[PDB]
Design a protein around this nucleic acid. Structure first.
Ligand SMILES: Cc1cn([C@H]2C[C@H](O)[C@@H](COP(=O)(O)NP(=O)(O)OP(=O)(O)O)O2)c(=O)[nH]c1=O
Ligand SMILES: [Mg+2]
Ligand SMILES: [Mg+2]
Ligand code: NA
Ligand code: NA
Length: 321
DNA sequence: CCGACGTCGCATCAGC
DNA sequence: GCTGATGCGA
DNA sequence: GTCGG
């Protein structure tokens, strides 16, 4: 409904992040963009938008200019700037951030071709990102995601039937499509007060050719790439997968957070504060009278957390906000 | 006016 | 060689 | 860039 405006702002967001290296202005512009994307009227003036939490004066002027002229001078100029449009563009390769993109572009390396003639100046992560540049900007239909889930749960269980594994993120909320697969993994032998538990699982998903590459991997977090096996039909795009190993006592705080949504997590956490509780990704802790969080409270399911702060347990179907 | 604005695991660099 | 800092993604 | 202490 204000796509013209929310695109304008989303473009501005990226340049701040990618060219100006001003992460907070990026987030500001995104916040503005979100709040407007939900406003159910066609905006008529910058003054009208300025009412929304997150649209201040400078953005209200931009909207004014945009509504009157159909463009923004600053955006027009920057879009056409050889250096800046190039720095902004190379950041689309996973693993190249604004700092690596600046350096390339400084040494003349501007395009995906340029990257392709310079593999040796790229780290491992960045090469996988180049390799799969296209696939990484595709969404994943739920149908494939269910096929992916099948594989992960089968293979996890087959390594050791006592592992618990939950596919979280936009998939667990019932979205028709996902941008990646986030897997949360625990095992009764692993608690906070507690050692190749993640490795054996990556091992097995590699063994059956589900996991095809590795961005990064430690004792707790796996970041890599995976692909469904090819059915006649054309093969499946490579997909981003993360696998996290969480201690059992923090596992459900984990599930809940990595289930989201963003906005839902904000509310729930705010609410929980006003009920005298502190929730992070790991633990819910009781705020005392001066405001000192004491020991973490025992959690054994999701619903537990909801009880604690007296909220009606939420089916993830309804965790939009 | 002027500081907060998410926090953290992992890879890899800069410094010693 | 080790330790902390920075970049990156999410 | 926006907000708020
Ligand atoms: C990025 C982000 C994620 N989260 C939580 C909620 C997300 O649903 C969950 C996974 O994040 P995601 O993979 O970036 N977004 P998504 O999985 O809900 O949907 P998709 O990956 O865009 O398809 O992590 C936050 O609580 N704050 C954040 O800033
Ligand atoms: Mg800057
Ligand atoms: Mg996701
Ligand atoms: Na305002
Ligand atoms: Na990038």
């Amino acid at each position: 409904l204000n796509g013209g405006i929310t695109d304008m702002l989303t473009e501005l967001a990226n340049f701040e992040k990618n060219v100006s290296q001003a992460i907070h202005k990026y987030n500001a512009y995104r916040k503005a963009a979100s709040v407007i994307a939900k406003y159910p009227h066609k905006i008529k003036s910058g003054a009208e938008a300025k009412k929304l939490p997150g649209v201040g004066t400078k953005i209200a002027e931009k909207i004014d200019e945009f509504l009157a002229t159909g463009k923004l001078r600053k955006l027009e100029k920057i879009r056409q700037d050889d250096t800046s449009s190039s720095i902004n563009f190379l950041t689309r390769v996973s693993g190249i951030g604004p700092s690596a993109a600046r350096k390339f572009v400084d040494e003349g390396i501007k395009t995906l071709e340029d990257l392709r003639k310079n593999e040796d100046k790229l780290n491992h992560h960045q090469r996988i990102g180049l390799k799969y540049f296209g696939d990484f900007e595709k969404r994943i239909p739920r149908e494939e995601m269910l096929q992916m889930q099948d594989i992960v749960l089968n293979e996890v269980k087959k390594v050791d039937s006592e592992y618990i594994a939950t596919v979280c993120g936009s998939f667990r909320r019932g979205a028709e499509s996902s941008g990646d697969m986030d897997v949360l993994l625990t095992h009764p032998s692993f608690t906070s007060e507690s050692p190749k538990l993640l490795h054996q699982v990556v091992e097995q998903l590699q063994k059956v050719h589900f996991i095809t590459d590795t961005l990064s991997k430690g004792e707790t977090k796996f970041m890599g790439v995976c692909q469904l096996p090819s059915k006649d039909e054309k093969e499946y795009p490579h997909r981003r997968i993360d696998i996290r190993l969480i201690p059992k006592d923090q596992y459900y705080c984990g599930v809940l957070y990595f289930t989201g949504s963003d906005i839902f997590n904000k509310n729930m956490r705010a609410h929980a504060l006003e009920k005298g509780f502190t929730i992070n990704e790991y633990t819910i802790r009781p705020l005392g009278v001066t405001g000192v969080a004491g020991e973490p409270l025992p959690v054994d399911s999701e619903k537990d957390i909801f009880d604690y702060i007296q909220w009606k347990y939420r089916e993830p179907k309804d965790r939009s906000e």
